[PDB]
Design a protein around this ligand. Sequence first.
Ligand SMILES: Cc1cccc(C(=O)N2CCC(C(N)=O)CC2)c1
Ligand SMILES: [Zn+2]
Ligand SMILES: [Zn+2]
Ligand SMILES: [Zn+2]
Length: 459
Amino acid sequence: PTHLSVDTKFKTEGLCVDIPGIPKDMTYRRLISMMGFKMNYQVNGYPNMFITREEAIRHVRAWIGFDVEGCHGTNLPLQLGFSTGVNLVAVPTPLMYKGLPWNVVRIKIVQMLSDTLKNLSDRVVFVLWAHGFELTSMKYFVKIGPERTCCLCDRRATCFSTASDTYACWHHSIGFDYVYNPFMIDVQQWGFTGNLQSNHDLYCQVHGNAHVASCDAIMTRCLAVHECFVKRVDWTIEYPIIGDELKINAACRKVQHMVVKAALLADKFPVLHDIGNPKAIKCVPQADVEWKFYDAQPCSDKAYKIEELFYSYHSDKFTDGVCLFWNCNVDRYPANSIVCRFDTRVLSNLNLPGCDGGSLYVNKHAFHTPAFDKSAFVNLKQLPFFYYSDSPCESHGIDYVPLKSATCITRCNLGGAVCRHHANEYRLYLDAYNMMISAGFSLWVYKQFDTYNLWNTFT
Ligand SMILES: Cc1cccc(C(=O)N2CCC(C(N)=O)CC2)c1
Ligand SMILES: [Zn+2]
Ligand SMILES: [Zn+2]
Ligand SMILES: [Zn+2]
């Protein structure tokens, strides 16, 4: 069940206008052969250019939508589009480049895929809505063969140079001319009615169709992400560590405790309504409050309507005390809320472009997140940075400069000289806070919140 059998059937109706006469009866084996590659009954970790829906989902970080459009087949120029927004024109002799032979076009393709993917993935998955010219164009920029390692590292080979006769990974690929052992999946095999634009536009208003290869490449990947991550969700799939996943996750846990602890000391709510993760624990275990939990999974399509979360008849009175939405994305938080909300517009190696202004946040798990919406926070304000500790001032066991800060809310600062312990803890908490913010999370609080109210929790 692991890899896609080359003897699996491929539906060819999508191909039959670019490739008139194509047999209705077709295997991957016969297709790969038609595309001009040979698999030489090779047991060597590359059983099939094509992959399963499941294998594609495990390798979502590798997805590059790919589309070719006739400009005028061997006679005519081809427009090559990628979900990066790039259009190359190959001649057989948004970004829109003029006509150039394959021997240069293939160099740009390696550069582009290398720069896009070296910090995402060990491979490429071309995501297709196949009509034929994209499949027949692959021979011009792709070599296949046994799985290999980089010449300069232990990462698997994704590129090949005919100049030096060597293999590189995405990190070491500079001056290479061929994509080596790519993967591909044809979305059109998944059983849709009607064309790409009609299927994409059911779900997504944010990507248009200018009738250029890059636009279709983008719609193809977007529709795929919609199918695999919006409509269908799988929180039982792991994904490897490629960045600061672990620091960001730790940071998030530290800020959550800090902000909620300070909220209860400052405003002394008798009840907290904790709306979201059904595995959640009390983030402030010692706090005095009545802690009531409401279960909701991450919304991956549209933000939850607060009408549905709350009404339809709990503590019922969610106007009593404070509401904690920790990555529980709604359309409009009530005024008595503490909110963490992911900003889908953030550029990072963890956040992949998604469907209808949403983004795909891949950190241990994959979480499609609805489009960041400023209007959601109208009853709240941005939560200002601050560090609060009631821990004793006592070093124990990190070279020093005396810390001066208005936002270091401690006994020692109240007494006008921050102790070394609270200065180390403060500087750590600020780093965590910046990690978390710069990872795209944004924090919001009820308007009455005032760090001034914390200073009398020491007297
Ligand atoms: C509502 C709920 C249920 C379960 C877990 C969470 C949570 O805390 N997430 C998931 C989504 C989040 C994101 N949008 O990136 C990353 C961490 C939220
Ligand atoms: Zn390498
Ligand atoms: Zn789209
Ligand atoms: Zn101190």
